[PDB]
Amino acid sequence: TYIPMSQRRSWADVKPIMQDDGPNPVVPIMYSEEYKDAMDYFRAIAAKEEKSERALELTEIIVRMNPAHYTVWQYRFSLLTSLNKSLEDELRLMNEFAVQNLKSYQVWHHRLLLLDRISPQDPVSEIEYIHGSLLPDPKNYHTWAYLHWLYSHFSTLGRISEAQWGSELDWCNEMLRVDGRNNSAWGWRWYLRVSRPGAETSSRSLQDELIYILKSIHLIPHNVSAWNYLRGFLKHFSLPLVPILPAILPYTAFPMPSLPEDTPLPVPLALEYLADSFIEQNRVDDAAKVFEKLSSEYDQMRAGYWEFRRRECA
Amino acid sequence: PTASACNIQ
Amino acid sequence: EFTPSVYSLVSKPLPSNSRPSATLDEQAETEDLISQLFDLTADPNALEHGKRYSGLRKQEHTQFLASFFQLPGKFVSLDASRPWLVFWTVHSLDLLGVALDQGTKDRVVSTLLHFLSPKGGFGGGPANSQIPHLLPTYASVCSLAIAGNDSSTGGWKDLAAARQSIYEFFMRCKRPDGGFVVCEGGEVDVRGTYCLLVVATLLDIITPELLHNVDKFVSACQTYEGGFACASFPFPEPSCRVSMAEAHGGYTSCSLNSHFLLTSVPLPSFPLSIDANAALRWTVLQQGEPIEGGGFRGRTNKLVDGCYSWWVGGGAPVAEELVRREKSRKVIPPIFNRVALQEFTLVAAQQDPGSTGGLRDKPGKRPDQYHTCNNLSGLSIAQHKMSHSPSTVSSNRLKFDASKGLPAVKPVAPGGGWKNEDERQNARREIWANALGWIEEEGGEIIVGGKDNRINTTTPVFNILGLRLKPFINYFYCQE
Ligand SMILES: *C/C=C(\C)CC/C=C(\C)CCC=C(C)C
Numbered sequence: 001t002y003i004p005m006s007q008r009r010s011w012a013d014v015k016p017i018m019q020d021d022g023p024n025p026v027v028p029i030m031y032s033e034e035y036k037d038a039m040d041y042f043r044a045i046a047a048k049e050e051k052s053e054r055a056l057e058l059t060e061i062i063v064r065m066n067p068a069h070y071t072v073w074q075y076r077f078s079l080l081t082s083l084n085k086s087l088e089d090e091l092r093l094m095n096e097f098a099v100q101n102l103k104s105y106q107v108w109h110h111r112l113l114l115l116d117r118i119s120p121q122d123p124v125s126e127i128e129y130i131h132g133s134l135l136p137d138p139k140n141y142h143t144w145a146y147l148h149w150l151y152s153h154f155s156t157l158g159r160i161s162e163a164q165w166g167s168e169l170d171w172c173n174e175m176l177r178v179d180g181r182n183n184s185a186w187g188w189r190w191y192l193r194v195s196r197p198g199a200e201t202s203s204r205s206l207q208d209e210l211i212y213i214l215k216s217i218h219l220i221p222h223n224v225s226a227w228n229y230l231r232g233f234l235k236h237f238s239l240p241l242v243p244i245l246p247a248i249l250p251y252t253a254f255p256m257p258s259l260p261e262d263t264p265l266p267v268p269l270a271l272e273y274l275a276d277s278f279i280e281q282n283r284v285d286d287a288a289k290v291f292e293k294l295s296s297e298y299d300q301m302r303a304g305y306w307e308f309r310r311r312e313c314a
Numbered sequence: 315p316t317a318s319a320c321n322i323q
Numbered sequence: 324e325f326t327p328s329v330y331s332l333v334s335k336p337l338p339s340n341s342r343p344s345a346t347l348d349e350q351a352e353t354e355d356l357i358s359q360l361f362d363l364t365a366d367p368n369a370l371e372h373g374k375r376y377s378g379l380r381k382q383e384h385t386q387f388l389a390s391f392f393q394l395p396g397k398f399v400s401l402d403a404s405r406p407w408l409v410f411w412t413v414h415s416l417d418l419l420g421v422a423l424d425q426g427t428k429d430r431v432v433s434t435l436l437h438f439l440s441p442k443g444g445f446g447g448g449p450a451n452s453q454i455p456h457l458l459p460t461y462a463s464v465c466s467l468a469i470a471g472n473d474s475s476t477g478g479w480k481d482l483a484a485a486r487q488s489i490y491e492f493f494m495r496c497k498r499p500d501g502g503f504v505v506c507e508g509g510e511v512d513v514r515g516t517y518c519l520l521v522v523a524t525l526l527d528i529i530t531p532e533l534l535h536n537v538d539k540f541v542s543a544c545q546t547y548e549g550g551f552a553c554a555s556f557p558f559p560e561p562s563c564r565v566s567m568a569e570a571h572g573g574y575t576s577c578s579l580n581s582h583f584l585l586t587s588v589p590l591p592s593f594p595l596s597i598d599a600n601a602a603l604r605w606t607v608l609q610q611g612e613p614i615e616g617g618g619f620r621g622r623t624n625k626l627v628d629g630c631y632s633w634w635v636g637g638g639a640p641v642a643e644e645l646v647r648r649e650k651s652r653k654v655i656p657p658i659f660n661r662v663a664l665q666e667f668t669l670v671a672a673q674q675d676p677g678s679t680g681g682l683r684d685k686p687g688k689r690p691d692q693y694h695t696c697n698n699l700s701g702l703s704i705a706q707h708k709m710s711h712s713p714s715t716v717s718s719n720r721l722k723f724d725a726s727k728g729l730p731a732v733k734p735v736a737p738g739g740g741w742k743n744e745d746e747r748q749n750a751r752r753e754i755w756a757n758a759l760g761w762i763e764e765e766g767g768e769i770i771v772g773g774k775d776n777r778i779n780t781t782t783p784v785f786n787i788l789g790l791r792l793k794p795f796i797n798y799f800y801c802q803e
């Protein structure tokens with residue numbers, strides 16, 4: 001049985017405030033007894049700006065019922081700061097929420113604020129947890145963006161060691177080994193190998209990168225992720241497509257292809273590569289013809305787009 | 315028929 | 324010939340290459356679901372016994388939305404997003420061509436105005452319970468454009484009075500790098516930028532100090548794939564800005580729309596350019612194969628989702644326009660399958676007939692307000708050829724009255740406003756004019772399954788009907 005807060009000794013001194021959405025409001029929600037009661041007292045708590053333990057406990061009650069209540073989360077963190085609570089304890093609480101909440105903006109940002117304030121000298125323990133967090137959902141957009149922020153933030157403070165980066169790349173490589181179609185992992189690899197300020201860019205670092213990309217494509221020729229990464233790579237570093245063409249040509253029918261079972265030809269992205277190759281050689285006529293084949297046969301869903309590319313040649 | 319996992323806020 | 328029907332194309336699974344993964348397991352499973360539903364359903368383009376009729380069940384969807392009464396307790400998970408529940412409803416009803424009576428509209432207006440804080444901005448609920456937030460602010464302003472008017476009880480009057488406060492709220496949200504927090508102590512990403520720019524444009528509260536770095540924050544969101552990530556990180560003005568995640572359908576919509584809104588601002592070397600051709604490419608690459616109903620997906624190697632018909636499909640004409648301008652800088656068939664997309668909506672995205680109504684993520688998912696709104700928003704973009712017409716913008720410049728307008732906003736910093744009245748008025752004209760520069764190309768209409776499937780025309784970037792956008796923005800720029 002639920003005990004109304006009006007009958008609670010700890011709250012006897014608080015006069016609750018009713019929700020004010022006017023008369024006959026639209027989209028009204030049938031709140032539970034618990035939820036309404038808690039908000040009734042929160043309205044009073046926040047109105048008087050009381051920073052207390054009971055206020056803190058109340059915020060946990062509320063956010064558990066509605067993990068997306070940004071107002072309550074904002075008030076909670078101001079309580080953590082004001083009461084000088086153990087942010088480590090709160091971090092362990094967030095590990096329970098991260099289990100079933102999954103895709104709440106408010107949970108994730110709350111975790112971000114915690115780690116910003118705590119500002120640990122070595123974020124390795126948090127990095128690990130994030131990795132483990134990704135097992136149930138390897139493509140959680142919130143999580144990946146958070147990992148990006150964690151490494152970017154703490155590297156700006158100079159707390160990401162070369163050993164840390166190195167193990168991260170190992171972990172990323174393992175993610176792509178388990179599912180090479182994980183576009184989130186590809187995106188992370190781009191950060192580690194290309195976009196991050198401290199990325200190693202040498203005339204031999206490029207060698208290794210092409211080797212990795214090509215082998216990835218040869219393992220899974222119809223993987224859109226690998227193809228996009230390949231084009232973004234050549235484009236970013238202003239590399240010519242022509243020299244690497246021999247490794248792609250076979251898919252239009254440095255590591256080379258084998259051919260793997262269940263691999264229908266031609267691969268539309270390989271044709272795009274070939275077409276753009278012709279453009280690179282100023283052979284607009286030969287480019288148009290492959291663009292026309294994409295539009296007419298090999299990628300008809302984008303008939304109009306490939307028709308646009310074919311005209312872009314003329 | 316499960317609910318869709320589309321949060322935008 | 325450039326927008327082939329799904330039924331006129333060979334349905335074949337995504338090839339495995341003999342290397343199975345978790346991704347491929349879900350893809351195949353989803354392929355079977357959509358593929359079978361299409362088989363059960365009659366081809367919308369034909370003139371079949373025992374097969375389901377794919378016609379747009381408009382009356383079912385209207386009734387799904389009627390649930391203006393009360394929502395089940397399980398909606399508490401959106402107690403902080405009530406303005407979205409309002410927007411999804413009143414906008415869908417606008418697209419479905421169903422009018423609200425004046426009494427019901429007044430309720431909508433009154434409800435939203437109770438979400439308005441005197442300090443500035445709308446919250447996800449009553450002001451005495453929730454703090455202002457850029458998202459509910461967008462959803463509320465847009466909803467007031469749809470359900471409100473210019474009478475003493477229309478709501479527009481109240482917005483006009485709140486202009487200075489809303490602006491001051493916007494400034495408190497502003498970070499130095501050009502990003503915005505969605506609320507006090509809130510997260511930072513292009514969602515906030517989008518929602519803020521939309522409202523600032525409509526309410527005539529745009530200033531130089533408001534826009535500083537805002538453009539750089541968005542450009543830096545573009546990834547190697549061509550789409551845009553949620554946010555960009557500034558390494559300490561900043562040495563360099565790096566994208567923080569995958570190119571995403573929603574964030575790409577927010578990025579394209581934000582950047583587009585900025586292009587009409589009379590600032591020098593503003594806004595920082597994006598790669599229009601790469602954005603277009605990523606956009607068209609996200610449309611599913613025939614076997615998956617030709618619906619849009621939001622990320623590479625993930626599943627198609629009805630809600631992306633708007634986020635991805637609705638960004639197409641914005642990207643297409645940016646590409647057009649790109650080619651004119653140096654110096655036509657449709658850019659995506661407008662037919663297939665409609666088919667996905669009619670066949671796969673609609674709830675099974677004779678049930679609860681509403682549209683959905685995909686087969687196997689429950690319908691909801693959100694997917695109802697975004698499925699129909701995308702359907703609109705596909706049915707109607709939308710274009711930003713320079714001749715129309717020029718026509719708007721010619722009729723613009725700079726002598727009429729609401730009082731200028733008071734900037735936070737002394738020099739935060741426009742250099743002078745001339746610069747400000749030329750800025751007001753450009754922003755207003757371009758905001759009304761979207762037209763439906765006559766003869767460009769394509770209505771799969773017959774004219775009874777037709778819904779109304781939504782505006783790219785803003786996503787409200789042109790007939791709402793015009794009277795509304797005209798009110799705040801006093802161009803009525
Ligand atoms: C399943 C659908 C998802 C996760 C929605 C993703 C799209 C966005 C996030 C875009 C949100 C845009 C605004 C709130 C303006």
Ligand SMILES: O=S(=O)(O)CC(O)CNC1CCCCC1
Binds near residue numbers: 379380381382383384
């Ligand atoms: O599917 S719709 O939303 O277009 C409309 C709908 O379902 C109602 N059909 C009735 C029922 C029986 C006799 C007359 C019409």
Ligand SMILES: O=S(=O)(O)C[C@H](O)CNC1CCCCC1
Binds near residue numbers: 046442452
């Ligand atoms: O913005 S105003 O000052 O006009 C009104 C005001 O401050 C209301 N604050 C509530 C109180 C408790 C829940 C969160 C918001």
Ligand SMILES: O=S(=O)(O)C[C@H](O)CNC1CCCCC1
Binds near residue numbers: 772
């Ligand atoms: O496209 S047209 O306007 O030529 C024809 C038209 O709209 C047909 N709609 C049918 C008619 C009867 C019941 C169900 C739907």
Ligand SMILES: [Zn+2]
Binds near residue numbers: 318320628631684694
């Ligand atoms: Zn969705």
